[PDB]
Design a protein around this ligand. Structure first.
Ligand SMILES: Cc1occc1C(=O)Nc1ccncc1
Ligand SMILES: Cc1occc1C(=O)Nc1ccncc1
Ligand SMILES: Cc1occc1C(=O)Nc1ccncc1
Ligand SMILES: Cc1occc1C(=O)Nc1ccncc1
Ligand SMILES: [Cl-]
Ligand SMILES: [Cl-]
Ligand SMILES: [Cl-]
Lengths: 695, 697
């Protein structure tokens, strides 16, 4: 049910042993020694990874290493489509802008931070959550020049439980992290966007990297003189596999949760955030899909844009399903009524006042929040010409010296990036007509961005005519129209350009709404500090975990399937047979790698198949994970690596607010399948030899 | 494989059924010389099964079987299709026109008689052995002089089985006064609508209730206000004990057709011609239709039924091709015929190998013709609506060529035009469908094999299909109402003779009939060789583990209440519940609307004695019984012969079961009788129906 701080291992250890944990507490997390925690990394700021060899080999997801695979791919050596297998350490590819972060030490600095905060003065100060204020406290505690005295190390203080607990982390960051191996995208991204958030799942979502360091194993930027890191801890790989009900645990960096939402915040998340995102993206997606199905060239240009819109659309559908069917609002209401009754009994009304402040703030900002989501989903992300070029102040106060040619060249560059190889003005006009029709139905005239008032005033309510006029008269409406402008440019032409005026008006309204809504966050945040302090004082810090905040957490559970609906069961494990069932040669998402299809036909599974002779692919577990946990190590009762977390089923996306024991699962790639791919698909035996594979 | 057994075969199957869980005495299920449970089973309205469930002739069948009778009695004031219908007294039950229930009074083996009569052979290749006319002459000869007049309500019929190796005479008792008694609302009766067609898990309460009325002596009589409910020989007791996983289940009913004795070459033909062409052509038709329905809400209303009608056999063909591809249907037919050929060689009789060779050679010879026939039937006859536009009859052309006979012919042509261009017809949707269908048809069918008018696409329109279709509508008398009216004011045979739409329709129907006539002779050598083929299979492996193909005659099948795994890591259990209906509820989707009385019953858990041991309300279950079209409404029995449900569908994964039963995938989809009784009770409030049934604990 939770995402526990490493400090909370002591408090959860007995229950973990009762559930099947076999390892000693300090072998998993030792606060003043080496433990399994030292083999877990924050991979490139937004993923988890794990060290799996005494020479710094790192496993993470294929979707986590995707950008590094794509950046090294060319027409001659397309690593993204065929995979990549460095047959020697010297062939491993360096990556620019990459990092791996180790959590060297974790310290409770609550008393220190709370004492420092007493010197504020303004009781409503937000310094208690400010990264700048907390960094000043971290630097004061670690010492003026800590990083010079301790190379590779840095300190950081974060707030937890809404400001009721503070932890200081001593981090060790390595920036020379090289690409070692990756399966073809047909394996790494098998279901592609069709199987996103889906269980059963058949995706071998893994990639392999290596941490390089100086001669003393200290962090160093890329240098041909760097040598592999010899880590103090790395995971052993288990080949014992998994069975239904086996104990499983994860360590990783979950990004965000909202476990302490009030019932009013759940209602707002549903009726504003989710319903608007669902409604607006369903309109955008429908027009886009119609156009992609009618023209194969439009399908190529808009596939990525369509997939990018669908991902959070599906998440919002899954989240709304939990709100509707799993009683999220009711359980938050019961949580807050229980605190209010307890507070009345203690003679302390501050908890009821805090819940009241959150409800009143949520109620006050509703119309503004609705207008913000409507414009952001409807126009800012909904219509491509909303992000068309807007002449800067430096460009207009240059057009009206011969820096006129310099202003036009910069405007041309931005026009070329807007009307790129994947942009269709015809597809965009059709999407805009549908999006704006919905937006104008929902947003009243007095709340419209200035230019959109012209639909009623100038175009007699004709949305199609308004959009047609924007393109017919705009300098960014076509290449010929831009070139005619570029030959005789004037600031007067730009000032009255219908596309410039649209883009400017909608961005102006978007920024105005953001600025008016931003002050409402602070009273909610301050009242949450009181609210969570009351919940902790009442029911204790053991059942209620602190919200995720991109810090190292552990979660535990079992390898277990679930029933998604009446008379349907999805088991705990998928097999290579399921990959073959899904094969579709005329669907790029479900193409099966020929080497993998051959391995399946010959049953060349070696030591990786289960006792039945079937080849495992993926499994699911009752662990509590969220975005940030991609690539997390999945451990046995013995702490051995049994898989990598790579996704979570859509039925459990509401788990960020309330864990759903009967539906929510972590989707994990079986480590036996990872080794099978390295071995029979990549032929990279050296990686198998450097890992410590236990029977 | 797990057959549709003749009633005659119950004796030789009985021991295995007892070992599988059957508890009843053999002759209580079927006795050729006296009353048995077989007497409570009826052929409901020619194409469904039904069952007698009371001593006053009450009949249960599917909602989709009684659909036309419910719809015919529905009005704007009393919409029984939408809200259901519950007659609170026998006098309120609604009579139905053109309805029948058929009882199988007696079944007799007449093989020796038919085979002796057939020996008077004037031609060894005669097809009289399969002719309904010839067999009726033999049935009338055996039954006697004016049997139907001496035994009113009874009729005699002989059917061939095992390709002409076995003949049975059936004495049927037909009742035509069958009245509507009760029906749940469509929201329960057809809950999944076409979305859940062929789907398991299933949550549809697919039942309707009728009553057989008869004269004072219980003899068949047409509708009369003097008719009294029938007192039957036998009726089913209703069980409330429910079902559990692995329970024995059996069905009696009228499966229509199977092809269990196809050669491997007939499986290849069914896949590569019949199914692939139907799939490819309907996918094109459906895609254009769906795009037009999604863009215009009025087109969606006009084309929903046409779209659903095209999709039903499209889905069946997809399911059947999945079995051919993944379940080894072709290979198992090949093994069946190689085993017979090896045995025949050992017996010194080459006639079985010669028979299989004749079927293969005939299948190979007709391939191009069969491909051209399916291409035109799926592509144009079914695919393009203006293919069924009006064609002036010979008598209409003669009438239009001096007299008032001219205006009579024009009125007749107008009537047919009005039926073609009706409230659901869109010429714009039809032109778009035709352009796509014809583009595919012209790519597949060479110029020399095209219907005469379609040659104009290359000759006159320079390969432009859109221009050809545009010209048909712009210049045709049936292209629009104003164009028809201009013709009707000044009509001439000359205008009709050169009309592009008339010429198109005439040419495609001419080609369709020519292909049918050229292909028809190929059926006879296959049929005669199948008589030899099946005789060999029966002589070799006996009439014990190979059932005769279904032919709309009474059969029994047995199995277990059991779910299945449709794919890797997925399991569908044996039973669905009312909870699953609630999970599927969607008020803005007519297909998944939930009746308020039913939703309230679920909320209050007002399930009474009908609920399972865990307090869950059962809805439907699935079984390993072998059923097909014709089995809709069939009684599902317990090990004791008590009614536990009604068969109403089969999952798409098992549609290949008509050729080869699929033990691990094929299931009969059954409405739980506890759910039927719950709906009658808590939704209909028709307590009198519960009281007349014999409900056992
Ligand atoms: C009803 C159903 O049956 C199978 C899948 C679904 C479904 O809703 N899928 C889904 C929902 C949200 N995001 C992604 C996928
Ligand atoms: C068919 C079904 O519907 C709801 C649940 C199930 C089911 O099979 N459950 C199950 C199977 C295996 N392990 C654990 C539980
Ligand atoms: C692969 C699959 O998963 C769920 C359903 C299907 C499917 O193909 N359904 C279907 C096929 C043929 N006729 C009817 C329905
Ligand atoms: C076969 C299968 O694949 C994935 C899950 C299952 C499963 O649960 N099987 C099962 C459940 C209940 N009774 C019998 C079998
Ligand atoms: Cl380290
Ligand atoms: Cl012979
Ligand atoms: Cl099977």
């Amino acid at each position: 049910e939770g995402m526990w701080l490493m400090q909370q291992l002591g408090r959860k250890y007995a229950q973990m042993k009762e559930r099947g944990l076999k390892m000693k507490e300090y072998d998993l997390y030792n606060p003043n020694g080496t433990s399994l925690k030292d083999a877990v990394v924050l991979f490139d700021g937004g993923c988890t990874g794990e060290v799996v060899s005494d020479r710094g080999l790192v496993l993470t997801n294929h979707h986590c290493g995707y950008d590094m695979i794509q950046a090294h791919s060319t027409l001659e050596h397309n690593y993204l489509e065929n995979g990549f297998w460095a047959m020697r350490e010297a062939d491993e590819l360096p990556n620019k802008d990459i990092s791996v972060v180790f959590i060297d030490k974790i310290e409770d600095v609550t008393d220190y931070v709370k004492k420092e905060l007493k010197a504020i003065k303004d009781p409503n100060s937000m310094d208690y959550l400010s990264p700048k204020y907390l960094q000043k406290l971290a630097d004061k505690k670690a010492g003026k020049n800590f990083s010079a005295k301790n190379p590779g190390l840095s300190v950081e203080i974060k707030a937890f439980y809404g400001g009721n607990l503070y932890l200081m982390f001593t981090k060790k960051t390595y920036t020379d992290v090289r690409l070692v191996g990756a399966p073809p995208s047909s394996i790494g991204k098998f279901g592609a966007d069709t199987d996103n958030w889906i269980w059963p799942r058949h995706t071998g979502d893994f990639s392999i990297f290596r941490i390089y360091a100086d001669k003393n194993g200290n962090p160093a930027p890329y240098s041909e003189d760097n040598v592999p890191l010899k880590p103090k801890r790395f995971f052993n790989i288990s080949l014992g596999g998994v069975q239904e009900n086996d104990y499983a645990m994860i360590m990783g960096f979950p990004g965000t949760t909202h476990r302490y939402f009030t019932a009013s915040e759940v209602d707002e998340w549903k009726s504003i955030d989710n319903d608007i995102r669902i409604r607006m993206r369903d309109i955008r997606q429908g027009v886009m899909l119609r156009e992609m199905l009618a023209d194969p060239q439009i399908k190529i240009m808009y596939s990525a844009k369509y997939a990018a819109s669908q991902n959070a659309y599906k998440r919002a559908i899954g989240a709304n399903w939990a709100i509707k069917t799993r009683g999220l609002r009711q359980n938050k209401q019961a949580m807050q009524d229980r605190l209010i009754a307890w507070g009345a009994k203690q003679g302390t009304p501050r908890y009821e006042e805090a819940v009241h402040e959150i409800d009143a703030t949520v109620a006050k900002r509703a119309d503004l929040r609705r207008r913000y989501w409507m414009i952001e989903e409807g126009i800012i992300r909904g219509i491509e010409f909303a992000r068309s070029p807007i002449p800067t102040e430096d460009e207009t106060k240059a057009l009206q010296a011969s820096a006129r040619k310099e202003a036009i060249d910069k405007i041309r560059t931005r026009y070329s990036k807007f009307a790129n190889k994947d942009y269709s003005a015809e597809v965009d006009k059709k999407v805009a007509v549908a999006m704006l029709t919905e937006y104008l139905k929902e947003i009243p005239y007095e709340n419209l961005p200035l230019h959109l008032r012209l639909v009623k005033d100038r175009f007699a309510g004709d949305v199609q005519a308004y959009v047609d006029d924007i393109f017919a008269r705009s300098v960014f409406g076509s290449e010929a129209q831009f070139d005619a402008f570029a030959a005789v440019p004037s600031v007067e032409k730009l000032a009255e350009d219908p596309m410039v005026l649209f883009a400017s008006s909608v961005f102006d309204e978007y920024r105005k709404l953001y600025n008016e809504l931003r002050p409402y966050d602070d009273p909610i945040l301050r009242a949450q500090r009181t609210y969570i302090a009351g919940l902790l004082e009442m029911d204790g810090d053991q059942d209620q975990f602190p919200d995720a905040n991109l810090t190292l957490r552990f979660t535990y559970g079992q390898v277990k399937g679930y029933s998604p609906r009446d008379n349907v069961y999805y088991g705990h494990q998928t097999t290579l047979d399921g990959v073959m069932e899904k094969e579709d040669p005329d669907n790029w998402e479900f193409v099966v790698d020929p080497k993998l299809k051959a391995v399946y036909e010959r049953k060349d599974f070696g030591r990786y198949a289960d006792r039945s002779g079937r080849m495992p692919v993926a499994f699911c577990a009752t662990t509590h994970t969220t975005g940030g946990n991609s690539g997390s190590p999945v451990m046995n009762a013995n702490g051995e690596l049994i898989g990598l977390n790579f996704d979570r089923n859509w039925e459990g996306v509401g788990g960020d607010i309330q864990y759903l024991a009967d539906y929510q699962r972590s989707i994990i790639v079986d480590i036996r399948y990872v080794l099978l791919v390295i071995d029979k698909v990549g032929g990279c035996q050296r990686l198998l030899d450097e890992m410590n594979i236990v029977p």
